[PDB]
UniProtKB/Swiss-Prot annotation, chain A:
The chain crosses the membrane at residues 5-36, 45-65, 180-199, 226-254, 269-286. Changing residue 86 to R: In MCAD and MCAR. Keywords: CBS domain, Cell membrane, Chloride, Chloride channel, Disease variant, Ion channel, Ion transport, Membrane, Phosphoprotein, Repeat, Transmembrane, Transmembrane helix, Transport, Voltage-gated channel. GO terms for molecular function: protein homodimerization activity; voltage-gated chloride channel activity. Changing residue 331 to W: In MCAR; uncertain significance; no effect on chloride channel activity. This is Chloride channel protein 1.
């Protein structure tokens, strides 16, 4: 209803902003390709531009990322998933930086450097949610955050149900069912709006998701290479685990040393782009895309990975097909260029997410997963090129399903989740390999549970951002040992002293100053309005207390005190004994306890 | 791990049972069609058999439904969703009746009467979960129920993620994320096992879902009839609401009167089958399937609804295609037989779910939705038969997407949920109409929120099964005002009197008999084992401190928030003290009596 009006205005503006950003991204980067081709093939000058228009665009990006934004460098989802799990930072929830981030993200989005959209877009979507909530009540909190999360990811990719899942399944402990209905409503109306405008304005075809990967969908797998799918699970999780490890090996490499931070801060702004230099030194297409097919911006890259044809038998024919023509060097085998492509995008991608950019950890890992999938699909084409039979028709395999299941599996391994597979097929446009990708997602996730933590927990761990998860433990001396006193029986100056002596917003109220049994709470404005209604007749002059419930039992273990404030989601712990108040136990002290 | 071994053995045996039941259903009902055709087309004799093998199979069904099962008639999901939301009935969770239900359900499944599998299959899956939990700890509770729910629906249809959603989104308030991970793991391993065995043994093709409805999936909709999709939402929810109203009009008709219950109980077992008699009088194919396409068991019926062809232009050709040949009468228009088909399945389906059968409320509503959808798709083919253009190619519409979106939409209206759309496309095998069916599911659900309650809440309401949901309210005199007393300081007979005087399993323990400030709890077996270890040296002849009970109930806690209190705790009692001095014990059924007001 009115809440539905809140959700639909949220989703409509969110879809407008997303359409605008990939509109600018597409036009900018096609102009990059345009000028790069059309000037002249000059080994000084095209190497000059193959460095420098990424280099202008990306020190331009980091310029906007760092100067205008006082704090919004390196933003994402884990800080706000910590916010909903307790640590509120209203200073980090500034309206002014939202607009300051997103255009920087557009310079991240129009780049050739593989970056992730999803994190900071979710962050600014929650910002938008809070802003419209601020506009509400002119015509609770973790609900707003959760709806913002779901709306953000589902309005990135037009994937409704996968987005509301990726809100729910990782960034929560318990969940209120109103907010899924809100998120489903808003998310599907958003993804509706996201696609229709790309036909009303500048045109997609009609109602594709993004991607139609027309497989044969008729005798697809078959069930003979099927346990080989088991193999295509396993090592993915292993490599995904390895990814986080070297990321931790560079999270240390974030700030292992201060002397190079000083040598940095001699001119601090300049940092990331130099390795952009060397990856440009590893990306130049008549330099190195001779061996790698470097002329692949990531969206068309994953589409050309998804081409429904066998490249062993397109090593059979040298026919210039569409963009898949870039997958040919005429001498050396294409499995080798896929191998080197994969590994160089890998030790490019760790640094690509390393640099001070607000970035999600999705887009490069799914590309590398898709690479791994099409590698092994083409070697399966190598091993049995004959194919198998059906009723007077010979059917041979096609590798794009292997690529799409791996492109689910690796980011499922990175983020310790499963809805990566749902948005995988819901982005794919066909649901052929659906049960193989969920089974392989299971296998990758259990291997990841076996070895390594998640991406974002390791991020907040090494960043030491305050949370944490869930012989001698003795827990009694944590409480805060002073609470104010109120009685309502008063004359003039006694009511004034109750106003003046106190500081905080709302007020706890006990039974008596001696018994100290807490009763309820008080607002100051009510007292002041009582003083108003008292004042109204003067110059020759002619709501019961809502109750605070509980007591903390003085030896409540860290796991179960953590569980206590988890279940409450509430402010304090008023500790009494025999009703006589003992103290107030708080949250950051429990964080200091869980440090041990 | 070991918990994963629990889940995978659960799902494998569950899939074995599901494969067995639809194996028997298929073979039985194809033998029905076989003999019915193959004897002779005799207007006495085939009418005899068109009554009587439905009539033998279904009083056979109800025979097994009612005699062996003492209480399992009319089972389903709403009673167990009330169990997980509080009212535990261990006597209803008997192992012995699980096997007694399912074979009865197979006689319900091999029937020609449209019944629902999903409810009682979820019920017996939770039974299996609890049974294997009983087998666990030889090598909490609502977790077992929730996993059982997801495993049950996802192992009915081989639809994993829709099953774990339909577990979560309706049968909960809050939810612990370990149990969804458990349920999806088990659910997808189940749907894996469910499909592969239908190729290892007697053969499906390879790895279809059930259904491949090969639409063109290339220029599918297009976006010109698109707001008409809006139209195909709206009235569906209205219609879904109407269904529940008449269901309530027969839920009253369950027991509006006692004299016909007496006239019934003159021979009580006989009740449902007489309308089975009369549904044969409107289904007999050279009697009424002349007007009905009566030779349609529901699974092939919904598949032939999903045939990718235009029946206005197959009113254009009289070509005998496949099973779609039953959609032809050569004189009168097929939209008319679709209309009468729809309405007669409607006032068939109300009675089909009325009768004392453990039944889910999905498959007949799925048929009626698919009927309505292909109805409106073919009239859209009637209104603009020309089709539209694309790049030197004329494209005309095809109605099966309209049928599949309506087959989502109406049961989405019935059950007040959204995962009906996920299992709709995930059963469909293609995801063409994905955003239209979710949008239409939204429209149906908001119309349903506007008008009517859900199916199962109305069921437990009229059945008056104890729950309930969420000027002068004063809430202080609910508590139970006696608690026992324990001290641990004792000699022989004092410890024996503490053993003998008490009744319940565990024991609350207060500070002193005067201060009455509650401390913790006690087991009896610990007392008996200390007396044992004391006995051990005799005839010339320390590891567990008291674990604490925490809380106090504030004596005026409102019904909404006391309901919320026991919701958040999920726990037994409410120990009410004042100043620490214990006042009473507030319980759950008393709160149910309060929420009666």
């Amino acid at each position: 209803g009115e809440d539905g009006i809140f959700l639909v205005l949220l989703g409509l503006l969110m879809a407008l902003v997303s359409w605008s950003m990939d509109y600018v991204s597409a036009k900018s980067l096609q102009a990059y390709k345009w000028s790069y081709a059309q000037m002249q093939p000059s080994l000084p000058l095209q190497f000059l531009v193959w460095v420098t228009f990424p280099l202008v665009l990306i020190l331009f990006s980091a310029l906007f990322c760092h100067l205008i934004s006082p704090q919004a460098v390196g933003s994402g989802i884990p800080e706000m998933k910590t916010i909903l799990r307790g640590v509120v930072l209203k200073e980090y929830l500034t309206m002014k930086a939202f607009v300051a981030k997103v255009v920087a993200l557009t310079a991240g989005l129009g780049s050739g450097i593989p970056v992730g959209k999803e994190g900071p877009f979710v962050h600014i979507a929650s910002i938008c949610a809070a802003v419209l909530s601020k506009f509400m009540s002119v015509f609770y909190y973790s609900d707003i955050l959760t709806v913002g999360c779901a709306v953000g990811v589902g309005c990135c990719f037009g994937t409704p149900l996968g987005g509301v899942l990726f809100s729910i399944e990782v960034t929560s402990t318990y969940f209120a069912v109103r907010n899924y209905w809100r998120g489903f409503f808003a998310a599907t109306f958003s993804a509706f709006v996201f696609r229709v405008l790309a036909v009303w304005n500048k045109d997609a075809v009609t109602i594709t998701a993004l991607f139609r990967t027309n497989f044969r969908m008729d005798f697809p797998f078959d069930l003979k290479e099927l346990p080989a799918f088991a193999a295509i699970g396993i090592c993915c999780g292993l490599l995904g685990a390895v990814f986080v490890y070297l990321h931790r090996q560079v999270m240390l490499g974030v700030r292992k040393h201060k002397a190079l931070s000083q040598f940095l801060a001699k001119h601090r702004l300049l940092y990331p782009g130099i390795v952009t230099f060397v990856i440009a030194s590893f990306t130049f297409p008549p330099g190195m895309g001779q061996f790698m097919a470097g002329e692949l911006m990531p969206r068309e890259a994953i589409s050309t990975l998804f081409d429904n044809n066998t490249w062993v038998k397109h090593a059979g024919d040298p026919e210039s097909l569409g963009q898949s023509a870039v997958w040919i060097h005429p001498r050396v085998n294409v499995v080798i260029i896929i191998f080197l492509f994969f590994v160089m995008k890998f030790w490019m991608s760790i640094v690509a997410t390393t640099m001070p950019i607000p970035c999600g950890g999705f887009m490069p890992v799914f590309v590398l997963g898709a690479a791994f999938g099409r590698l092994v699909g083409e070697i399966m084409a190598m091993l049995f090129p004959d194919g198998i039979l059906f009723d007077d028709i010979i059917y041979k395999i096609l590798p794009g399903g292997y690529a799409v299941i791996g492109a689910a599996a690796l980011t499922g391994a990175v983020s310790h989740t499963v809805s990566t597979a749902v948005i995988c097929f819901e982005l794919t446009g066909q649901i052929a390999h659906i049960l193989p990708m969920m089974v392989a997602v299971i296998l990758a996730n259990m291997v990841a549970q076996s070895l390594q933590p998640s991406l974002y927990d390791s991020i907040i761990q090494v960043k030491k951002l305050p949370y944490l998860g869930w012989y001698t433990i003795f827990v009694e001396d944590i409480m805060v040992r002073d609470v104010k006193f109120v009685s309502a029986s008063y004359t003039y100056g006694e009511l004034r002293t109750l106003l003046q002596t106190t500081t905080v917003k709302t007020l706890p109220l006990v039974d008596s100053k001696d018994s100290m049994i807490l009763l309820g709470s008080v607002e100051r404005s009510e007292l002041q309005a009582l003083l108003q209604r008292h004042l109204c007749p003067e110059r020759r002059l002619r709501c019961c207390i809502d109750q605070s419930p509980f007591q903390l039992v003085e030896q409540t273990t860290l796991h179960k005190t953590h569980t206590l404030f988890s279940l409450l989601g509430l402010h304090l712990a008023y500790v009494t004994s025999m009703g006589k108040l003992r103290g107030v136990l708080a949250l950051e002290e429990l964080q200091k306890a869980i440090e041990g």
